[PDB]
Design a binder for this molecule. Structure first.
Ligand SMILES: CCN(CCO)C(=O)c1ccc(Cl)cc1Cl
Ligand SMILES: CCN(CCO)C(=O)c1ccc(Cl)cc1Cl
Lengths: 237, 300
């Protein structure tokens, strides 16, 4: 069934599962032709596939070449997402294959189900949560490897850096959703928060700064304030 | 002409024969139906005045033997039986004819509704869907479930319709995932027509039989079969032009014949709005489209 507030903690049990987000698979910059008409120009994209328990990210880069000569690209994006996800499952050892895959948008259910017919014991599920994974391209290192890529490319990350050395998955997921939600609501301000202190660096093998626990609390509070504020400024409250 | 005679009618019952229905009162002198047009399959069915639960009936073809109706007081239904003594069946059909205790099947000269509703239905196929080979006739009722329904308990009482499943390996070629799921031509034309049914008449026969079991018995599983076999044609970009035109006629008469008051359970909003307005064949069902909008524009 669907994944919501109520069964939120299933994500952190010991059943392997993956989130798939497809929002940044097919990306365009709309512009004007010399004749005053509008055309799109595609740029590289990503499938965002995330193990919420381990933090492992399988960033599948979608090169603009994949669209050449194809019609109905927004519909094609969802079938390409599914084809690539099934190929990832197929490539993993059986004991590493997920027991569930949770798609962050309902339009992905049928494409994936069809591509995963070979795996009937893998449950494909929607969610009722408004997760902020579209903001993953506001993370500099992820955006950079997507934009620079020259071919199809799978890149592996841990989106939690070393956090699990010190906190639980549930708490790590909560920090991550807080960060991405803030980046989504006001990227400039979110980014300004993360880097106000030039002395807190990002390790070459990490995505986010090396905060102490005390600095994470400060940071986490500052992201909460931003997300509340930008609600006022939008709704006037 | 051919005749389905009756022992008697001991319990108050509504008898329907193809698209018609009529009432018989407890122990009224009723000894069956005569002048039944030879050359078609027929259905004779029953709804007891007291338990409108369980419509039941029998599919049959008079060419395949002499059949009669006897009320069983143990099992509590009107049962179809075969008289193997041709000579002795012939005889009592006369006293029934001469005492005028048989109603006349209306051989109306301005219809073709039953021909059209059963054009491709053949007793031989019916009997492969309703498995019970000691009899030449086939029993169906409200509550019987389909092979596909039993998958998701008793299989001898099954409607063994052809399994259609749009999200199955049979339906989707590896590597054409998107293609075959948005254009089902491969599944219809190669899997079903050439593979399973062999020709479009056998397909059309199952479709028609499924619709008829849905309407006269409200068999829920049949209605799902009917809608599925329709949806598969309408979701295929490539259909033999002859099939399309014949499908328009088939559906036209099925909608024509449907009870106006039954359209809420037996018609699937999604399937028809998709077949008539979104699918590849939205422009290929002119008669069916026209009669749906004059009659049931509510559903759309
Ligand atoms: C005794 C054999 N028999 C009924 C079986 O017990 C009949 O002879 C008979 C009576 C009435 C009718 Cl409509 C048909 C028939 Cl076949
Ligand atoms: C259409 C005529 N009629 C009115 C239906 O309500 C009948 O009752 C009728 C139908 C079929 C047969 Cl075999 C005999 C009879 Cl009496």
């Amino acid at each position: 069934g669907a994944m919501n507030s109520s069964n939120y903690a299933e994500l952190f049990n010991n059943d392997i599962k993956l989130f798939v987000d497809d929002t940044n698979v097919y990306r365009v910059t709309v512009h004007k032709t010399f004749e005053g008409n509008v055309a799109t120009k595609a740029i590289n994209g990503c499938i965002f596939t995330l193990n919420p328990k381990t933090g492992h990210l399988f960033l599948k880069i979608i090169h603009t070449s994949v669209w050449a000569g194809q019609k109905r690209l927004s519909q094609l994006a969802k079938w390409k997402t599914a084809e690539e996800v099934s190929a990832l499952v197929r490539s993993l050892p059986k004991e590493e294959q997920p027991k569930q895959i949770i798609v962050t948008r309902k339009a992905m259910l049928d494409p994936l189900e069809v591509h995963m017919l070979d795996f009937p014991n893998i449950a494909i599920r929607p969610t009722e949560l408004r997760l902020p994974f579209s903001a993953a391209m506001s993370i500099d290192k992820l955006s950079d490897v997507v934009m620079k890529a020259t071919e199809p490319q799978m890149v592996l990350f841990n989106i939690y850096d070393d956090w699990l050395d010190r906190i639980s998955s549930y708490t790590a997921f909560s920090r991550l959703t807080l960060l991405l939600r803030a980046l989504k609501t006001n990227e400039e301000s979110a980014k300004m928060i993360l880097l106000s202190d030039p002395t807190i660096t990002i390790k070459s093998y990490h995505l986010w700064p090396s905060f102490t626990d005390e600095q994470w609390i400060t940071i986490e509070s500052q992201m909460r304030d931003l997300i509340l504020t930008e609600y006022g400024r939008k709704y006037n409250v | 002409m051919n005749t389905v005679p009756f022992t008697s009618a001991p319990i108050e019952v509504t008898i329907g024969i193809d698209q018609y229905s009529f009432n018989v009162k407890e122990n009224q002198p009723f000894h069956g139906i005569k002048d039944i047009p030879i050359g078609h399959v027929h259905v004779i069915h029953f709804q007891h005045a007291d338990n409108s639960s369980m419509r039941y009936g029998y599919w049959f073809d008079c060419r395949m033997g002499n059949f009669y109706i006897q009320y069983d007081p143990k099992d509590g239904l009107y049962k179809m039986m075969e008289e193997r003594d041709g000579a002795k069946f012939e005889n009592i059909v006369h006293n029934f004819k001469e005492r005028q205790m048989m109603v006349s099947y209306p051989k109306i000269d301005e219809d073709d509704t039953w021909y059209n509703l059963t054009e491709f239905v053949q007793m031989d196929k019916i009997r492969k869907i309703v498995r019970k080979d000691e009899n030449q006739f086939s029993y169906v009722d409200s509550s019987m479930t389909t092979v596909q329904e039993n998958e998701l308990s008793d299989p001898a009482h099954s409607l063994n319709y052809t399994v259609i499943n749009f999200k199955s390996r049979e339906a989707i070629r590896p590597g054409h995932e998107m293609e075959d799921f948005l254009d089902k031509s491969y599944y219809l034309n190669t899997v079903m027509l050439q593979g399973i049914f062999k020709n479009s008449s056998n397909y059309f026969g199952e479709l028609q039989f499924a619709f008829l079991n849905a309407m006269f018995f409200g068999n829920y599983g049949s209605s799902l079969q009917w809608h599925a076999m329709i949806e598969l044609i309408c979701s295929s970009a490539t259909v033999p032009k002859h099939m399309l035109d014949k499908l328009d006629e088939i559906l036209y008469y099925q909608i024509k014949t449907l009870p106006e008051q039954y359209s809420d359970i037996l018609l699937n909003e999604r399937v028809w709005n998709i077949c008539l307005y979104s699918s590849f064949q939205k422009n290929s069902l002119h008669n069916t489209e026209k009669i749906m909008e004059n009659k049931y524009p509510e559903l759309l």
